[PDB]
Amino acid sequence: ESADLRALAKHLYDSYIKSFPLTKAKARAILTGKTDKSPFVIYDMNSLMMGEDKIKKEVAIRIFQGCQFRSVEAVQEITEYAKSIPGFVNLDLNDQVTLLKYGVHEIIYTMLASLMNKDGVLISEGQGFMTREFLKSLRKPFGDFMEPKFEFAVKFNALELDDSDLAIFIAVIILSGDRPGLLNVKPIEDIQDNLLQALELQLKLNHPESSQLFAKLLQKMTDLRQIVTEHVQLLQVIKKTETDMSLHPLLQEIYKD
Numbered sequence: 001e002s003a004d005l006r007a008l009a010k011h012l013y014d015s016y017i018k019s020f021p022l023t024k025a026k027a028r029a030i031l032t033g034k035t036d037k038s039p040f041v042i043y044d045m046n047s048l049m050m051g052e053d054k055i056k057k058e059v060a061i062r063i064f065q066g067c068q069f070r071s072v073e074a075v076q077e078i079t080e081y082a083k084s085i086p087g088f089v090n091l092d093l094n095d096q097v098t099l100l101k102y103g104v105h106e107i108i109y110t111m112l113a114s115l116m117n118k119d120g121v122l123i124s125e126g127q128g129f130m131t132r133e134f135l136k137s138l139r140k141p142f143g144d145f146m147e148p149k150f151e152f153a154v155k156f157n158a159l160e161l162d163d164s165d166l167a168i169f170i171a172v173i174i175l176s177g178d179r180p181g182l183l184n185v186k187p188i189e190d191i192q193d194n195l196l197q198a199l200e201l202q203l204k205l206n207h208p209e210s211s212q213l214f215a216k217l218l219q220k221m222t223d224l225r226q227i228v229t230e231h232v233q234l235l236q237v238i239k240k241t242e243t244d245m246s247l248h249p250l251l252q253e254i255y256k257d
């Protein structure tokens, strides 16, 4: 039934809104130019220095540790969104964990897109905007830790997806039956079918002229996994050249792999 699938979509979009403070709708309103939502822009050290005057150790390390604590917040939000996914809580508690462990970052970078444009990314809930050039000018080896993200975004953002489409897509990602260490794959794969079903209808109804967007979008999951692995490697270098740099526990458990 179309109606059954449309219902599940409605249900998801709804949980999505309740779980994420900064939707793409808002993110775009702020980047577009739609006077009371205008961000302070950080493009150099001095602006950075001035940012803390109104926006919410070392400069590169202070920024990196900023992303850390921020993703830890993202994990808590996605984890809450997961629970609302019909069937996810009924799954084995161990696989409930495994899925989150492998789906967390893929999702963070998908939604991180909503906050970017070719020349920069929104920070602190949209209060600010840090340019892509500044981050790139970060002392090695922190200079290129956002570069491959920006490339993903410009490509992904090109699909023109809105919040309702994403809610189902990040749902499809979490319920991936091909995760390392899954005990019961069958139950997980049946939920995803439903999700893929929902998504497929969603895109067709929401993007009538965008041919094979369903397939186009699904292919992006390759770019996402690509990005994660590149990150893990970088992280390995960091921990060696920066033995005096700590990592948030939650973020370390997820990385043990």
Ligand SMILES: *[C@@H](/C=C/CC(=O)CCC(=O)O)C/C=C\C/C=C\C/C=C\C/C=C\CC
Pocket (backbone or CB within 6 Å): 056, 063, 066, 067, 068, 070, 071, 121, 122, 123, 124, 125, 231, 251
């Ligand atoms: C940087 C986030 C990068 C995500 C990442 O790869 C690290 C995650 C991990 O597990 O290692 C920030 C991206 C967007 C900014 C959004 C909000 C502001 C948070 C940090 C930005 C720096 C200072 C602002 C407080």
